[PDB]
Amino acid sequence: MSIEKIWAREILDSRGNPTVEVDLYTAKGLFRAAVPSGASTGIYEALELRDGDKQRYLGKGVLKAVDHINSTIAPALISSGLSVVEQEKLDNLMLELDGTENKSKFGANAILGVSLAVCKAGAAERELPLYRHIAQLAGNSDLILPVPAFNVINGGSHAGNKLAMQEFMILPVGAESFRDAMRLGAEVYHTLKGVIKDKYGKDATNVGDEGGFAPNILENSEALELVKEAIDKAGYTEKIVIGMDVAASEFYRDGKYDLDFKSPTDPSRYITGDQLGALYQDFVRDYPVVSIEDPFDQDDWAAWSKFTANVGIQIVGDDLTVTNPKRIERAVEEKACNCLLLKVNQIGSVTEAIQACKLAQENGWGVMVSHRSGETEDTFIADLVVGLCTGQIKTGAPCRSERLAKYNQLMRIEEELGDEARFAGHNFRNPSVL
Amino acid sequence: MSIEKIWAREILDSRGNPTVEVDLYTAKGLFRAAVPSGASTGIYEALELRDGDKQRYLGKGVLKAVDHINSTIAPALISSGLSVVEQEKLDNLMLELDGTENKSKFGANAILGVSLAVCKAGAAERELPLYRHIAQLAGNSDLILPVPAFNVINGGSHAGNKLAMQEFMILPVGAESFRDAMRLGAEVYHTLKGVIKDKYGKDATNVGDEGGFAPNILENSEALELVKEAIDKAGYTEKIVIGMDVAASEFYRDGKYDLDFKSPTDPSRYITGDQLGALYQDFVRDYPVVSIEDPFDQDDWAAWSKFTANVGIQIVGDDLTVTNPKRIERAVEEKACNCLLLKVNQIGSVTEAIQACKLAQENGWGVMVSHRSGETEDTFIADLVVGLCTGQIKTGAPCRSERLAKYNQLMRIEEELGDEARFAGHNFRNPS
Ligand SMILES: [Mg+2]
Ligand SMILES: [Mg+2]
Numbered sequence: 001m002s003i004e005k006i007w008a009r010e011i012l013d014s015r016g017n018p019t020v021e022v023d024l025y026t027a028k029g030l031f032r033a034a035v036p037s038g039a040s041t042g043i044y045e046a047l048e049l050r051d052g053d054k055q056r057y058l059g060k061g062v063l064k065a066v067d068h069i070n071s072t073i074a075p076a077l078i079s080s081g082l083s084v085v086e087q088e089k090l091d092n093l094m095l096e097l098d099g100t101e102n103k104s105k106f107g108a109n110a111i112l113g114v115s116l117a118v119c120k121a122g123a124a125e126r127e128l129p130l131y132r133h134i135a136q137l138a139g140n141s142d143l144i145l146p147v148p149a150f151n152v153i154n155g156g157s158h159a160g161n162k163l164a165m166q167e168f169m170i171l172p173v174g175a176e177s178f179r180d181a182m183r184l185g186a187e188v189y190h191t192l193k194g195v196i197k198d199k200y201g202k203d204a205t206n207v208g209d210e211g212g213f214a215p216n217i218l219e220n221s222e223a224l225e226l227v228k229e230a231i232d233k234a235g236y237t238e239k240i241v242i243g244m245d246v247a248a249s250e251f252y253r254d255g256k257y258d259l260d261f262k263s264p265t266d267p268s269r270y271i272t273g274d275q276l277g278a279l280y281q282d283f284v285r286d287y288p289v290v291s292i293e294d295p296f297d298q299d300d301w302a303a304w305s306k307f308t309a310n311v312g313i314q315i316v317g318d319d320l321t322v323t324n325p326k327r328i329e330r331a332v333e334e335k336a337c338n339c340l341l342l343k344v345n346q347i348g349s350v351t352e353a354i355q356a357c358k359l360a361q362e363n364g365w366g367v368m369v370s371h372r373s374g375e376t377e378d379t380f381i382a383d384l385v386v387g388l389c390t391g392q393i394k395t396g397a398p399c400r401s402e403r404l405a406k407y408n409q410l411m412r413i414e415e416e417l418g419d420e421a422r423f424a425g426h427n428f429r430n431p432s433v434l
Numbered sequence: 435m436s437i438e439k440i441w442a443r444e445i446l447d448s449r450g451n452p453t454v455e456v457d458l459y460t461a462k463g464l465f466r467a468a469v470p471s472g473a474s475t476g477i478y479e480a481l482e483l484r485d486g487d488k489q490r491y492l493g494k495g496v497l498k499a500v501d502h503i504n505s506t507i508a509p510a511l512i513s514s515g516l517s518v519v520e521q522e523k524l525d526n527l528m529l530e531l532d533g534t535e536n537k538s539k540f541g542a543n544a545i546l547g548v549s550l551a552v553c554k555a556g557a558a559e560r561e562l563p564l565y566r567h568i569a570q571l572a573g574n575s576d577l578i579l580p581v582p583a584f585n586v587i588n589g590g591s592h593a594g595n596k597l598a599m600q601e602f603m604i605l606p607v608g609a610e611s612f613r614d615a616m617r618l619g620a621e622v623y624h625t626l627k628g629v630i631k632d633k634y635g636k637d638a639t640n641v642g643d644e645g646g647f648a649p650n651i652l653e654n655s656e657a658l659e660l661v662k663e664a665i666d667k668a669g670y671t672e673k674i675v676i677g678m679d680v681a682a683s684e685f686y687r688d689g690k691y692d693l694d695f696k697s698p699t700d701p702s703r704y705i706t707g708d709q710l711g712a713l714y715q716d717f718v719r720d721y722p723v724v725s726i727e728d729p730f731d732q733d734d735w736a737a738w739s740k741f742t743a744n745v746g747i748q749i750v751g752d753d754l755t756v757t758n759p760k761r762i763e764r765a766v767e768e769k770a771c772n773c774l775l776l777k778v779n780q781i782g783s784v785t786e787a788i789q790a791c792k793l794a795q796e797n798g799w800g801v802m803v804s805h806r807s808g809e810t811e812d813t814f815i816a817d818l819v820v821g822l823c824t825g826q827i828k829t830g831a832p833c834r835s836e837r838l839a840k841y842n843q844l845m846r847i848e849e850e851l852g853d854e855a856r857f858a859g860h861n862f863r864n865p866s
């Protein structure tokens with residue numbers, strides 16, 4: 001009926017690791033989607049199925065996930081009789097076919113790749129651009145261009161430096177449009193390179209996984225100083241603010257936090273959740289920080305709720321909520337945070353991701369659509385953040401094209417929307433208030 | 435007629451600089467292409483037109499080039515009534531509309547953006563995959579999957595280290611297929627990170643513009659040691675060899691060469707072209723180096739010919755030849771090199787790039803299709819290298835998706851070709 005052919009293959013992501021790509025065919029043509037991959041993955045994330053074959057890609061192959069698609073998932077959907085516009089029914093069938101909570105039979109990367117391809121096929125079957133099809137799936141009717149959050153300084157578990165905290169972001173909230181926001185982001189990014197070079201030398205101007213610079217610094221306050229200095233020299237103090245992804249789960253040790261966890265282990269330097277919270281308060285006071293992601297461990301609920309109750313800024317749950325309704329519901333009840341980081345590969349399907357988004361928005365939460373540290377040339381989340389009208393997205397620094405592909409696509413979307421294009425601007429936290 | 439709309443816009447490349455993207459519409463749909471951008475550009479390259487507005491993208495804007503397409507080029511091609519399959523006529527039309535030798539009026543980035551989009555539109559009009567359309571444009575019958583050249587160690591002008599030479603590449607010539615070559619490249623790349631980290635620390639495992647690691651090293655022989663270490667440790671000593679892009683023009687200092695040109699100037703450390711040649715001889719002797727690109731300055735013709743005459747490996751012209759038939763002809767007669775690095779943005783059009791490729795191949799040269807240090811999500815050169823059957827391509831490390839998009843596309847082309855697919859392997863110099 002609707003689906004003529006589904007064919008999955010093995011491609012390489014932005015880090016050189018294998019990941020899932022899915023080709024879905026209908027009468028209207030070919031629809032291709034790829035699955036991202038995280039590095040600092042939360043323990044409650046849906047299962048990313050790897051082969052474990054040590055003599056092939058060091059055990060990081062995804063032939064098992066690919067086979068699960070080509071052998072089991074593909075014929076099931078083909079013989080289902082469901083139109084590709086039926087996103088929820090097609091996703092539910094894959095959920096039922098898997099039958100496990102964390103998608104541990106087929107793998108979340110196997111299920112998502114199909115779910116993404118189905119969505120694009122459904123859009124064309126609907127004769128709609130992808131972002132508008134997503135809008136209808138979510139029950140939205142008034143699209144919004146998001147404020148981009150550029151990770152210009154990379155730290156954390158997979159960055160070549162001492163910098164403990166993972167991401168230092170800039171948000172051009174005072175930009176005129178999204179295309180203007182892209183300009184402000186790039187100019188500060190290029191300005192930041194000079195600032196870092198002048199102070200630390202050229203060795204500190206190489207980049208990490210997400211395109212942000214990886215300077216040889218330790219103190220996170222210094223990363224904020226550099227970024228702030230770059231904003232000012234670029235001449236955008238009044239238009240650009242700062243966001244952070246701490247990813248505190250990555251340096252959570254023995255009930256405490258280690259802000260020097262890439263140095264030889266020494267428990268004497270560890271700090272408590274209270275001390276860590278007091279450090280954030282200093283950051284918010286001393287710098288234009290308006291958003292902090294994963295300030296505490298994924299299971300340190302008491303620290304989350306206590307800190308959130310004493311700040312006015314955006315508190316983003318990432319590893320805490322893992323785009324999971326069952327986890328979000330708890331966080332809502334406990335007021336652990338006021339914003340959800342939406343990662344489609346954390347939950348495994350488009351339908352579940354949309355449900356997770358609306359569950360957040362219903363409770364007055366902000367929503368930030370996000371990429372993974374390992375991405376592809378796929379640009380799905382660009383149309384996603386527009387269709388869901390969340391008003392904020394982080395998909396990398398203005399560097400490395402697995403990041404720019406999303407940003408460029410968003411510029412195309414704003415162009416396509418014409419005079420009906422709206423930039424979230426200073427209302428990125430609650431874009432519907434626009 | 436054929437072309438219904440041509441619309442250009444401003445997008446960002448892999449290093450955050452503006453570049454040209456062109457949307458071309460026919461009855462068969464939308465065909466999109468983007469223009470790459472170089473950093474270590476040769477002085478004889480066709481003009482990359484930048485706005486120069488200091489208050490916008492630090493003067494790197496491409497609004498003028500975009501405007502030249504939308505206001506001038508597009509209505510001229512639409513009024514021509516030429517079919518998109520007529521690649522040569524459409525390219526010639528833009529060349530004549532520009533009317534300048536180095537495409538200084540519209541910019542090479544403006545002309546190429548349309549030329550690339552036209553080519554993709556022509557492929558669909560012919561009901562052919564892009565690589566087959568290109569093959570017929572070049573008059574080729576039997577296709578070839580190229581050996582990938584992964585730039586796994588980054589040095590040079592725009593890398594955050596002391597390393598003078600620009601690119602250190604691995605070539606899985608002993609691979610079973612291109613998909614196998616991708617695995618070999620990635621596995622060595624990941625192994626190399628560990629090798630680098632163990633010796634220099636995690637600070638040295640960050641990447642440069644092309645995805646290769648940027649370790650804090652000075653010696654070029656050390657970069658070769660690290661690479662050779664990774665190959666052996668990965669278990670592919672017999673199957674993976676080494677290529678180099680020296681880009682000597684970047685450290686050419688009025689007759690001599692500075693292998694520490696990112697250090698404070700000291701002319702006493704400068705070496706002659708003869709010394710530099712002797713150094714390459716040492717590299718070829720001690721390491722499996724089978725290809726050297728731009729070993730001398732773009733104008734140091736005597737050094738090129740002298741060195742090429744005394745080596746048996748592949749000598750690749752990049753800034754020397756700039757994908758230009760006029761420069762290629764001179765290099766052929768003077769025997770300056772034996773391989774052409776094919777960059778479409780160096781000459782400005784698909785037609786001229788094909789002419790450049792065929793001219794090199796007619797004279798026994800190898801051809802390596804190449805990307806630029808500043809790339810986009812565009813994957814044209816993947817279809818280009820297969821269609822031109824050159825047998826070798828460098829489009830970055832197996833890191834950063836502006837590189838992987840090409841490599842992934844080449845894996846798709848191999849899968850699509852199936853039985854007809856042949857991997858160049860040890861014949862990467864001569865798949866002919
Ligand atoms: Mg993470
Ligand atoms: Mg995070």
Ligand SMILES: [Mg+2]
Nearest residue numbers: 472474475476
């Ligand atoms: Mg160059």
